[PDB]
């Protein structure tokens, strides 16, 4: 049986791992490569690298990152954040990335999703969808959640799958970084609208939140805080999820 996945996100900048509450006091939290090797040792099933590097340097810093990771990592990884065209995507994938994640550039040009799929295959395209409630409806937001695109979440997941995306990274702006729990309501809203895999992102705070996300229909649960700080032991989490009916990747001794 295909396993429900536990995913670890690493927000990175200019080649290093960053962790704060905003640009505010965005601080330095270590080497991306070595942290990924540690995540792969405890049981994390996949890695998501989210870069926010300066800008002029965004394109060259990401290639360096992929290459540094590709020579040491033994599990799949996605790369994203500021990938605005086919060129950037193809270089990251050819460079060693397993999948690329596009959001803002996907909404403005849905044909992009298709361009990547046609060459590398849906399996390589993750569309990150950042959503929030606005006047009772679920709205899509771009530019790191700072612009309401006016597109409904319901029409967009359908459009996204139609274009060829192979997976969706669904983040709830409402719960992101709050440790309160995943937005299971939003997950259930999207579950019926698509057959594509859903990675739940935002709000992870404790083991039970993962059980909640999966009961909502998520195929994978992503978090960054919790695993890093050690607040959650991945081994314990996988055993807890298995105990309660969720099929997870349980290593073993």
């Amino acid at each position: 049986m295909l396993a429900k996945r536990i995913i670890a996100c690493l927000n990175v900048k200019d080649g290093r791992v960053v962790k704060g509450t905003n640009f505010e006091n965005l601080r330095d939290s270590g080497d991306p490569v070595e942290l990924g090797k540690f995540y792969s040792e405890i049981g994390i099933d996949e890695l998501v690298f989210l870069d926010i590097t300066a800008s002029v340097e965004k394109r060259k810093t990401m290639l360096e990152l992929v290459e540094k990771v590709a020579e040491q990592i033994d599990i799949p990884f996605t790369v994203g954040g500021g990938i605005h065209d086919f060129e950037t995507a193809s270089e990251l994938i050819l460079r060693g990335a397993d999948k690329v994640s596009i959001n803002t550039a996907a909404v403005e040009n849905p044909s992009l999703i298709t361009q990547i799929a046609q060459t590398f295959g849906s399996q390589a395209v993750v569309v990150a969808i950042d959503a929030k409630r606005v006047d009772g409806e679920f709205m899509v937001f771009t530019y790191s959640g700072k612009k309401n695109t006016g597109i409904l979440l319901r029409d967009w997941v359908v459009e996204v799958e139609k274009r060829g995306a192979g997976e969706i990274l669904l983040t709830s702006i409402d719960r992101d970084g709050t440790k309160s729990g995943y937005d299971t309501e939003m997950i259930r809203f999207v579950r019926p609208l698509t057959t594509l895999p859903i990675i739940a992102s935002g709000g992870a705070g404790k083991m039970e939140h993962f059980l909640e996300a999966f009961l909502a229909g998520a195929d994978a649960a992503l978090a960054a805080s919790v695993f890093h700080f050690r607040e959650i032991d991945v081994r314990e989490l996988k055993e807890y999820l298995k105990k309660h009916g969720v099929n997870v990747r349980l290593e073993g001794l």
């Binding site: 049986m1 396993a3 590709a70 599990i75 799949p76 192979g166 290593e251």
Partner: protein, 200 residues
């Protein structure tokens, strides 16, 4: 020990190469070469990776004249290990490339999984008849193998469908998953392979 890795077929193959170098680590006089064309000498262990269309890979083995080269490996009793696209290239033909014949080193053909979630992508369990460690590995394919029971070496189920995730015909070995992407379990699978070639 001489290990070679065909590096022409489509897709990433450097990961396989790296996973393999990292595996061949804890072993004596064991080297690795990227087999980009027919060498003069034959390797003790050969890998046929790749990821992509069945046509291609076949059209890349032909083009750089590796077909005859690969074939000489089987004959001298040299392990020949396919991985992913390359395990499917061990068979006769595929619904992917109807006309196109493959290596045909193993009896069977390649059919499209009968699932509505076409791309079988994720960690799934592999049950082995023996030798390798049972557990979860990472998969990313759309097509599968259809071969006699005799060659089935590893089984995995996806959406009710049971299919041979591993394949075997003597010293020829096939694996449908990406051992390079299968964490700790992947390295032991890769090592067990190298340990099986330390005999012949």
């Amino acid at each position: 020990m001489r290990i070679g890795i065909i590096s022409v077929g489509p897709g990433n193959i450097m990961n396989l190469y790296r996973g393999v170098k990292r595996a061949s680590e804890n072993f004596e006089d064991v080297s690795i070469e990227l087999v980009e064309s027919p060498r003069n000498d034959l390797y003790d262990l050969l890998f046929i990776p790749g990821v992509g269309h069945f046509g291609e890979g076949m059209r890349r083995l032909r083009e750089n004249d590796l077909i005859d080269f690969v074939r000489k490996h089987v004959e001298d009793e040299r392990y020949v290990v396919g991985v992913c696209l390359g395990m499917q290239l061990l068979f006769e033909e595929s619904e992917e490339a109807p006309g196109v014949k493959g290596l045909s080193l193993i009896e069977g053909n390649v059919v499209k999984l009968r699932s509505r979630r076409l791309p079988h992508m994720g960690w799934n369990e592999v049950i082995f008849k023996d030798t390798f460690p049972n557990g979860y590995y990472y998969f990313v394919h759309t097509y599968r193998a259809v071969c006699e029971e005799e060659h089935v070496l590893g089984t995995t189920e996806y959406d009710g469908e049971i299919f041979p995730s591993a394949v075997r015909k003597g010293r020829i070995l096939g694996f449908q998953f990406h051992p390079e992407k299968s964490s700790k379990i992947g390295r032991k699978l890769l090592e067990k392979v190298i340990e099986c070639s330390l005999s012949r």
